[PDB]
């Protein structure tokens, strides 16, 4: 048996466990031979490129450029390695690569090249049909000057796509690279970095390429774009490339989905579902979808794969499958990147303000939306009318395909062309009537949307400050729409825009404070102020870092103080530590005086402090650098200034008031600290307004079924339940979300109260 | 081993010099290049000397048959080339950067010149040259020829010579075979020079009686893909473990029992 039992072990080189696993078991690395596999060098990659280009060089015929093509393709691969490294280095988000994706990229290149070569060259065959029309007209010889633009397009479009045909081959390469590889990337790296990267490769290679990307334009007809925009696809750029990426469908995809754009899109795109965790799903739902094609959507990936999921992944020929994640910043394995494409639907603020703009136009007065959608439908149909003009030109040009001139009705046809342009002129006028009127109706509100987006991207980051400060966009949307309903319209619409800016901020602010902890109270308001000013006031992130982080000259002050002199010393911070600051005339009392900021103000820059557009921030850089002792009250002070003193004021939550928020279909969590519990007060209220004592179940071990049966009693009746100590025994928590649902109906007046740590 | 041919008028003294020059190489390499926590497994002992010899001891008379090749080959030349390839594959493999490889090959050339102080110009012309020399393989050199049945005769097994063309052609031949053996094989394996070498190394380890080899590399390097062919050529059966919905221990035990009974009672050849 030992003579004929060979053992082949294949490990990863990276991670954590490999090295100490080797140290744990000596015989493992001892007896076995050891062999390394370095990554493929450029020679191997060009070899693969020519193995795949020989069989694919049917239409791409060019000597002395093919060899440079295969070379440059290797260069592209070596580069996406480096881009991966840089992304992980800066953003601490994992990215991987495999030769399988390179092969798939070659597949995409070949397939979409034969497709676009054949299609666009049938169109260029039609450019040559235009040449045939010109030739037959000339040799046979009113219309010749009417077809000035027509003959010009017929010649020059073909001549451009032709003389740049190798540059257009380059364009195909850029497009298919950006498709296949640049799925999982953020907006700074997506286009900018990748584009400059590929075009510098092309310039160094000296192979010819066309100026201008316009990736979306020459990929998909805008008719399907509009059709999707009816299907809920967001009207902005990033969603456009995302839809393209799903369209190409090189492999089954997997989305990073902080908000839920993809789930709703697929829910609407062609479908109009079965979760991963279900005993029937693993057996039933699989066989139904695999033998009759139900499309089997999944929505609960959390990096944990039931292994049976995989060999299904890699035999009905009518079956597809889209599956997505929920929690952002995934930690997907390298090979989970090998199988499926990855797409990030991390919302940018840029699209966010348009979405909020649409929703405010809705709720503030529906007549604005009536005018909006009316003119928008009209102008969309008028774009389609320009398309119908194009159809009319094509009909004029190739329906007869001979004897166009003998058709004297062609004269009427020529006139018909003119008539269509006339309605385009009306549409042209509408483009002005749109781009001012709706725009000013939007300019009344697009500041608001800006603020709204700012607020949201503030409250995102506190989640990274600590877990459990996590919430959706949906709750924020409910709060936003409500705020509009609560106080928005009185009269004098511009004044009510200013009242938006007053009220919305306070509403969302208080909502988040209800969950915040003491030491984080001051911080969230501080971040809100900065994120407000990073757009309007254009406050430098460098000056922010100056405000966060930071002696020969002066003699009286302390070494503890001289550290701070050098801290401030390294615009006019490096211009006024001299004899101005070293006067030592009256500021000695100042540094002695308590509350330096308020009564004994620095007169070092009296006008700068007077202006106040930035003078606050200047005063604060000064206060921190000089006296870190009194940072926090100064923090309260300029918060009161730039945001209003209403923020720096006490709040205490009336539990009777809070009860009004809790509908039956939402629970009440409680993030408590040592030496504090509201349980007595909750019971007291349940004796005051409600007439019965609540039931209580403490988490632990062997309490799931007890909790479930008491909850069922509450469902049928309408009592109150008090869970306790959820910080251990978390396996029951995931069940609760399924229970509290619209499906299983619940009697009114049923509340739930949750406590944890 | 020596007292079989008796044709070594001078190659016996050489052979002893090989016995000592392996030791000289062992001393130099073991001293010079060390383990650090990024290259912790750079560990050397007396095992590798045994492995070197275990590789050498083969071809009781197949080494003598230089007459078919005679590619400017004296009988000793093939022997020193075998020594070189052996020392490379037992020492010049488990090293991380190609530079480390380049220095061990420099060591090898220096030591070969040191011992081989009687034909040094010939080795410099032919095998100490960086050009490819004596790729050793078992299935390429002989062709079944499919006379009456496909597997007409077991190929000669001991040795092969240096060439890349017929290597790739038989590899593609074999790839087509593997395609029609396995339903839904779905294996677009691209065969380039380094991939061919890696398949050769897997062959070297799998074949040997009482051998095994740890394979390291990032995913996508293909080792899991390469081993399937490498096992099929060697007739070895292969089985993988499947982690059920319940992750437990009994699957391992029953699978190993079946493996032994394949390699025991039945006595077949297997791989894990
Ligand atoms: N030489 C190769 N050429 C093309 N594709 C490859 C090659 N090697 C591996 N792959 C791709 O990588 C996938 C996984 O290969 P695998 O053998 O698991 O590599 P590793 O063992 O390094 O993870 C395969 O399904 C295959 O598509």
Would you give the distance in Å from CA A437 to the centre of its chain?
A: 30
**Is the separation of the CB atoms in B58 and B82 below 8 Å?**
no
SS3 of A140-180: HCCHHHHCHHHHHHHHHHHHHHHHCHHHHHHHHHHHHHHHH
SS3 of A72-124: HHHHHHHHHHHHHHHHHHHHCCCCCCCHHHHHHHHHHHHHHHHHHHHHHHHHH
Main-chain dihedrals φ then ψ at residue A99, nearest 5 degrees: -60, -20
B174 CB neighbour count, 10 Å cutoff: 15
* Sequence-distant contacts of A281-285: CB under 8 A, at least 24 apart: A282/A306, A282/A308, A282/B245
**Is the separation of the CB atoms in A110 and A53 below 8 Å?**
no
Q: How far is B223 from chain A (nearest CA, A)?
A: 7
C-alpha to C-alpha distance for B194 and A41, rounded to whole angstroms: 10
* Residue recorded with tokens 């699957």: B251
> B194 CB less than 6 Å from ligand 1?
no
Atom of ligand 1 nearest to the CA of B218: 22
What is the DSSP track for A507-552?
A: HHHHHHHTT--GGGHHHHHHHHHHHHHTTTT---HHHHHHHH----
Name which of B155, B158, B148 is nearest B173 in CA terms: B155
Q: Are A335 and B219 within 8 A, CB to CB?
A: yes
Nearest-Cα residue of chain A relative to residue B51: A33
C-alpha to C-alpha distance for A543 and A568, rounded to whole angstroms: 12
**Is the separation of the CB atoms in A129 and A150 below 8 Å?**
no
What is the DSSP track for B28-65?
A: HHHHHS---TTSTT----SHHHHHHHHHHS--TTTTT-
Would you give the distance in Å from CA A414 to the centre of its chain?
A: 48
H helices present in A593-630, as ranges: 606-611, 615-626
* Chain B hits for A43, Cβ within 8 Å: 192-193
Q: Are B192 and A47 within 8 A, CB to CB?
A: yes
Tokens found for residue A460: 């995102």
**Is the separation of the CB atoms in B108 and B123 below 8 Å?**
no
Q: Which whole-number Å values give the CA distances from A233 to A260, A363, B163, in the listed order?
A: 12, 21, 58
> B185 CB less than 6 Å from ligand 1?
no
Exposure on the CB side of residue A720, measured as CA atoms within 13 A: 23
C-alpha to C-alpha distance for A233 and A185, rounded to whole angstroms: 20
Q: Which of B172, B220, B226 to mutate to test the interface with A (most CBs of A within 10 A)?
A: B220
Whether residue A98 lies within 8 A of chain B, CB to CB, comes out as yes
- Which runs of E-coded beta strand occur in A435-528? none
Tokens found for residue B66: 């230089």
Whether residue B239 lies within 8 A of chain A, CB to CB, comes out as no
> B190 CB less than 6 Å from ligand 1?
yes
Q: How far is A286 from chain B (nearest CA, A)?
A: 15
Main-chain dihedrals φ then ψ at residue A73, nearest 5 degrees: -70, -45
- Provide the residue count of chain B: 272
**CA triple A682-A740-A304, angle to 5 deg:** 115
* Chain A hits for B164, Cβ within 8 Å: none
> B196 CB less than 6 Å from ligand 1?
no
Tokens found for residue B86: 């052996």
Tokens found for residue A354: 């348009």
> A712 CB less than 6 Å from ligand 1?
no
Nearest-Cα residue of chain A relative to residue B195: A44
Name which of A216, A205, A252, A266 is nearest A104 in CA terms: A252
Which residues 182-221 on chain B approach chain A with CB closer than 8 angstroms?
A: 188, 190, 192-195, 198, 201-202, 205-206, 209-221
C-alpha to C-alpha distance for A622 and A644, rounded to whole angstroms: 22
In Å, the largest CA–CA distance within chain B is: 68
* Chain B hits for A36, Cβ within 8 Å: 93-96, 216-217
- Helix axes of A42-54 and B193-207: crossing angle, nearest 10 degrees: 110
Tokens found for residue B78: 């093939």
DSSP code at position A471: -
Name which of A101, A35, A6, A29 is nearest B197 in CA terms: A35
Q: Are B220 and A103 within 8 A, CB to CB?
A: no
Q: Is A37 helix (H, G, I), strand (E, B) or coil?
A: coil
Nearest-Cα residue of chain A relative to residue B192: A44
Name which of B136, B148, B40, B139 is nearest B94 in CA terms: B40
Nearest to B96 among A36, A307, A334 (CB): A36
Nearest to A37 among B205, B223, B243 (CB): B223
Contacts of A293 (CB under 8 A, 6+ apart): A316, A318, A319, A320
* Chain B hits for A39, Cβ within 8 Å: 218, 221
Would you give the distance in Å from CA A347 to the centre of its chain?
A: 3
Q: Side by side, which strands form the sheet with A695-698?
A: A695-698, A720-724, A751-753
Q: Is A654 helix (H, G, I), strand (E, B) or coil?
A: coil
C-alpha to C-alpha distance for A727 and A749, rounded to whole angstroms: 27
Contacts of A152 (CB under 8 A, 6+ apart): none
Q: Resolution in A for the shown PDB structure? A: 4.4
Q: Are B215 and A98 within 8 A, CB to CB?
A: no
Task: Quote the ligand 1 centre to B230 CA distance (angstroms).
Answer: 14
Whether residue A12 lies within 8 A of chain B, CB to CB, comes out as yes
Task: Quote the ligand 1 centre to A108 CA distance (angstroms).
Answer: 19
C-alpha to C-alpha distance for A424 and A418, rounded to whole angstroms: 10
Whether residue A4 lies within 8 A of chain B, CB to CB, comes out as yes
Nearest-Cα residue of chain A relative to residue B46: A30
Q: Side by side, which strands form the sheet with A7-11?
A: A7-11, B212-216, A33-35
Q: Are A8 and B271 within 8 A, CB to CB?
A: yes
> B215 CB less than 6 Å from ligand 1?
no
> A51 CB less than 6 Å from ligand 1?
no
Beta bridge partners of A342: A254
A360 CB neighbour count, 10 Å cutoff: 24
Q: Are A12 and B220 within 8 A, CB to CB?
A: no
What is the β-pairing status of strands A341-344 and A253-256? parallel
Task: Quote the ligand 1 centre to A99 CA distance (angstroms).
Answer: 7
Nearest-Cα residue of chain A relative to residue B224: A10
* Residue recorded with tokens 């987006």: A453
Q: Which of A26, A35, A105, A313 to mutate to test the interface with B (most CBs of B within 10 A)?
A: A35
B3 CB neighbour count, 10 Å cutoff: 7
> B267 CB less than 6 Å from ligand 1?
no
Contacts of A523 (CB under 8 A, 6+ apart): A465
Q: How far is A705 from chain B (nearest CA, A)?
A: 23
Pocket test for ligand 1, best of A338, A339, A340 (most atoms within 8 A of CB): A338
Give the helix/strand (H/E) hosting A323.
Answer: strand A323-325
Which residue has the least CA distance to atom 8 on ligand 1?
Answer: B222
Q: Is A705 helix (H, G, I), strand (E, B) or coil?
A: helix
What is the β-pairing status of strands B212-216 and A7-11? parallel
What is the β-pairing status of strands A323-325 and A695-698? unpaired
Q: How far is B96 from chain A (nearest CA, A)?
A: 7
Name which of B174, B164, B176 is nearest B144 in CA terms: B174
> B192 CB less than 6 Å from ligand 1?
no
Tokens found for residue B193: 């020079």
Give the helix/strand (H/E) hosting A455.
Answer: helix A446-465
C-alpha to C-alpha distance for A347 and A264, rounded to whole angstroms: 14
Which residue precedes each gap in chain A (C to N above 2.5 Å)? 141, 272, 314, 550, 570
Task: Quote the ligand 1 centre to A330 CA distance (angstroms).
Answer: 23
Name which of A94, A116, A119 is nearest A179 in CA terms: A116
Q: Provide the number of CB pairs (under 8 Å) joining chain A to chain B.
A: 142
- Which runs of E-coded beta strand occur in A163-319? 253-256, 298-301
C-alpha to C-alpha distance for A463 and A477, rounded to whole angstroms: 18
A73 CB neighbour count, 10 Å cutoff: 23
H helices present in A347-436, as ranges: 349-364, 366-398, 409-433
C-alpha to C-alpha distance for B81 and B87, rounded to whole angstroms: 10
**Is the separation of the CB atoms in B155 and B141 below 8 Å?**
yes
Pocket test for ligand 1, best of A98, A310, A314, A333 (most atoms within 8 A of CB): A98
> For residue A15, is it left (φ>0), alpha (ψ between -120 and 50) or beta?
left
What is the DSSP track for chain B?
A: --TTT---TTHHHHHHHHHHHHHHHHHHHHHHS---TTSTT----SHHHHHHHHHHS--TTTTT--TTT-SS--HHHHHHHHHHHHHHHHHSSS-SSHHHHHHHHHHHHHHHHHH--SSHHHHHHHTSSSS------SSSSS--TTSSSSS-SPPP-S-----SHHHHHHHHHHHHHHHHHSTT--------HHHHHHHHHHHHHHHSTT-EEEEE--TTS-HHHHHHHHHHHTT-EE------SS--SHHHHHHHHHHHHHHTTS---EE-
C-alpha to C-alpha distance for A675 and B175, rounded to whole angstroms: 72
DSSP code at position A438: I
Name which of B203, B98, B89 is nearest A39 in CA terms: B98
Nearest to B260 among A1, A43, A96 (CB): A1
**Is the separation of the CB atoms in A448 and A504 below 8 Å?**
yes
**CB-based burial, A446-484: b 16+ in 10 Å, e otherwise:** bbbbbbbbbbbebbbebeeeeeebeeebeebeebbeebb
A712 CB neighbour count, 10 Å cutoff: 12
Tokens found for residue A329: 């910043």
* Residue recorded with tokens 């870190």: A628
**Is the separation of the CB atoms in B122 and B14 below 8 Å?**
no
**Is the separation of the CB atoms in A533 and A539 below 8 Å?**
yes
* Residue recorded with tokens 């300029």: A638
H helices present in A644-732, as ranges: 655-661, 679-688, 704-717
C-alpha to C-alpha distance for A209 and A306, rounded to whole angstroms: 46
C-alpha to C-alpha distance for B266 and A615, rounded to whole angstroms: 90
Nearest to B217 among A3, A7, A36 (CB): A36
Q: Which whole-number Å values give the CA distances from A452 to A356, A538, A541, A712, in the listed order?
A: 7, 17, 21, 41
B16 CB neighbour count, 10 Å cutoff: 12
Whether residue B251 lies within 8 A of chain A, CB to CB, comes out as no
Would you give the distance in Å from CA A410 to the centre of its chain?
A: 52
**CA triple B66-B70-B73, angle to 5 deg:** 90
Contacts of A556 (CB under 8 A, 6+ apart): A584, A588
Task: Quote the ligand 1 centre to A403 CA distance (angstroms).
Answer: 60
C-alpha to C-alpha distance for A629 and A623, rounded to whole angstroms: 9
* Chain A hits for B214, Cβ within 8 Å: 9-11, 28-29, 32-35
Report helix, strand and coil shares of chain A as percent, to nearest 5. 60, 5, 35
DSSP code at position A635: H
Task: Quote the ligand 1 centre to B225 CA distance (angstroms).
Answer: 6
């Amino acid at each position: 048996v030992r003579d004929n039992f060979h053992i082949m072990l294949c490990f990863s080189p990276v991670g954590q466990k490999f090295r100490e696993r080797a140290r744990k078991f000596p015989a493992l690395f001892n007896e076995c031979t050891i062999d390394w596999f370095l990554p493929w060098p450029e020679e191997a990659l060009v070899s693969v490129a020519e193995t795949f280009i020989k069989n694919f060089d049917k239409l791409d015929t060019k000597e002395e450029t093919k060899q440079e093509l295969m070379k440059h393709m290797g260069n592209v691969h070596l580069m996406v390695n480096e881009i991966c490294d840089e992304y992980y280095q800066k953003m601490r988000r994992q990215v991987y690569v495999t030769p399988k994706s390179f092969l798939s990229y070659l597949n995409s290149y070949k397939t979409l090249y034969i497709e676009k070569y054949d299609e666009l060259d049938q169109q260029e065959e039609s450019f040559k049909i235009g040449l045939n029309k010109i030739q037959e007209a000339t040799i046979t010889i009113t219309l010749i000057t009417s077809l000035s633009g027509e003959k010009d397009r017929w010649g020059k479009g073909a001549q451009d796509i032709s003389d740049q045909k190798r540059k257009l081959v380059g364009n195909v390469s850029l497009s298919t690279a950006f498709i296949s590889y640049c799925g999982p990337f953020n907006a700074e790296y997506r286009n900018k970095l990748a584009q400059q990267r590929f075009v510098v490769d092309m310039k160094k290679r000296g192979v010819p390429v066309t100026p201008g990307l316009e990736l979306t334009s020459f990929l998909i007809d805008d008719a399907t774009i509009g059709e999707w925009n009816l299907q809920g696809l967001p009207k902005d750029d990033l969603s456009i490339q995302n839809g393209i990426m799903v369209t190409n469908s090189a492999r089954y995809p997997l989305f990073i989905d902080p908000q839920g754009q993809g789930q709703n899109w697929i829910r609407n795109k062609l479908s109009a579902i079965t979760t991963l965790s279900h005993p029937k799903f693993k057996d039933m739902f699989l066989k139904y979808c695999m033998e009759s094609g139900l499309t089997l959507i999944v929505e609960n990936i959390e990096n944990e794969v039931d292994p049976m999921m995989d060999p299904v992944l890699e035999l009905s020929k009518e079956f597809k499958l889209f599956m997505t994640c929920r929690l952002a910043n995934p930690s997907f394995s390298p090979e989970l990147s090998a199988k499926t494409t990855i797409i990030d639907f991390t919302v940018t603020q840029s699209g966010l303000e348009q979405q909020l703009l649409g929703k405010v136009i809705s709720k503030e007065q529906k007549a604005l939306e009536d005018s909006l959608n009316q003119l928008l439908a009209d102008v969309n149909q008028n774009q389609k009318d320009l398309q119908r003009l194009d159809k009319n030109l094509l009909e004029r040009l190739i329906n007869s395909q001979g004897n166009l001139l003998d058709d004297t009705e062609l004269m009427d046809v020529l006139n018909n062309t003119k008539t269509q342009a006339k309605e385009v002129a009306a549409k042209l006028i509408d483009a002005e009537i749109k781009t001012k009127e709706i725009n000013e109706k939007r300019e009344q509100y697009r500041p608001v949307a800006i603020r709204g987006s700012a607020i949201y991207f503030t409250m995102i980051e506190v989640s990274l400050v600590n877990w459990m400060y996590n919430s959706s966009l949906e709750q924020f949307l409910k709060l936003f729409i409500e705020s509009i309903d609560l106080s928005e319209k009185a009269q004098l619409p511009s004044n009510r825009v200013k009242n938006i800016i007053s009220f919305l901020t306070f509403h969302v602010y208080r909502y988040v404070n209800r969950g915040l902890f003491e030491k984080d109270k001051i911080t969230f308001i501080l971040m809100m102020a900065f994120k407000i000013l990073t757009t309007a006031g254009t406050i430098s992130s460098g000056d922010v870092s100056l405000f966060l982080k930071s002696q020969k000259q002066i003699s009286y002050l302390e070494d503890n103080q001289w550290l701070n002199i050098l801290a401030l010393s390294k615009p006019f911070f490096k211009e006024l530590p001299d004899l101005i600051s070293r006067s030592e005339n009256q500021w000695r009392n100042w540094i002695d005086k308590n509350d330096p900021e308020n009564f004994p103000i620095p007169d070092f820059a009296e006008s700068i402090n007077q202006e106040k557009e930035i003078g606050s921030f200047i005063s604060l850089c000064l206060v921190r650098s000089l006296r870190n002792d009194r940072t926090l009250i100064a923090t309260q002070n300029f918060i009161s200034n730039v945001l209003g003193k209403e923020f720096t004021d006490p709040i205490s939550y009336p539990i009777e008031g809070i009860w009004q928020e809790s509908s039956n279909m939402d629970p009440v969590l409680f993030l408590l600290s040592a030496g504090a519990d509201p349980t007595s007060s909750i019971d007291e209220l349940a004796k005051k307004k409600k007439k019965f004592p609540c039931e209580k179940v403490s988490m632990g071990e062997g309490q799931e079924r007890v909790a479930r049966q008491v909850i069922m009693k509450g469902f049928v009746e309408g009592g109150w339940v008090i869970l306790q100590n959820c910080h251990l025994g978390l396996k029951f928590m995931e069940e609760i979300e399924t229970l509290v649902s619209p499906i299983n109906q619940i009697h009114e007046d049923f509340r739930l109260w949750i406590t944890c740590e | 081993m020596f007292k079989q041919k008796y044709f070594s008028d001078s190659t016996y003294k050489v052979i002893e010099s090989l016995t000592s020059a392996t030791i000289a190489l062992w001393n130099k390499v073991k001293s010079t290049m060390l383990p650090t926590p990024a290259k912790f497994h750079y560990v050397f002992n007396m095992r590798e000397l045994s492995r070197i010899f275990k590789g050498i001891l083969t071809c009781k008379k197949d080494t003598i048959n230089d007459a078919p090749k005679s590619m400017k080959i004296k009988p000793e030349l093939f022997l020193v080339g075998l020594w070189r390839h052996e020392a490379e594959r037992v020492l010049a493999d488990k090293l991380v950067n190609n530079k480390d490889k380049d220095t061990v090959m420099g060591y090898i050339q220096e030591v070969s010149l040191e011992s081989f102080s009687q034909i040094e110009n010939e080795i410099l012309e032919k095998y100490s040259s960086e050009k490819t020399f004596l790729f050793c393989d078992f299935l390429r050199p002989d062709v079944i020829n499919e006379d009456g049945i496909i597997e007409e005769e077991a190929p000669k097994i001991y040795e092969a010579i240096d060439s890349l063309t017929e290597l790739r052609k038989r590899c593609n031949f074999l790839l087509s075979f593997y395609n029609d053996r396995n339903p839904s094989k779905k294996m677009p394996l691209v065969l380039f020079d380094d991939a061919l070498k890696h398949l050769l190394r897997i062959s070297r380890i799998i074949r040997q009686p009482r051998s095994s080899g740890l394979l390291v590399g990032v995913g996508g390097s293909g080792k899991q893909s390469l081993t399937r062919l490498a096992g099929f050529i060697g007739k070895n059966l292969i089985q993988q473990i499947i982690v059920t919905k319940t992750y437990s221990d009994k699957d391992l035990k029953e699978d190993i029992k079946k493996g032994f009974d394949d390699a025991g009672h039945l006595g077949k050849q297997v791989t894990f």
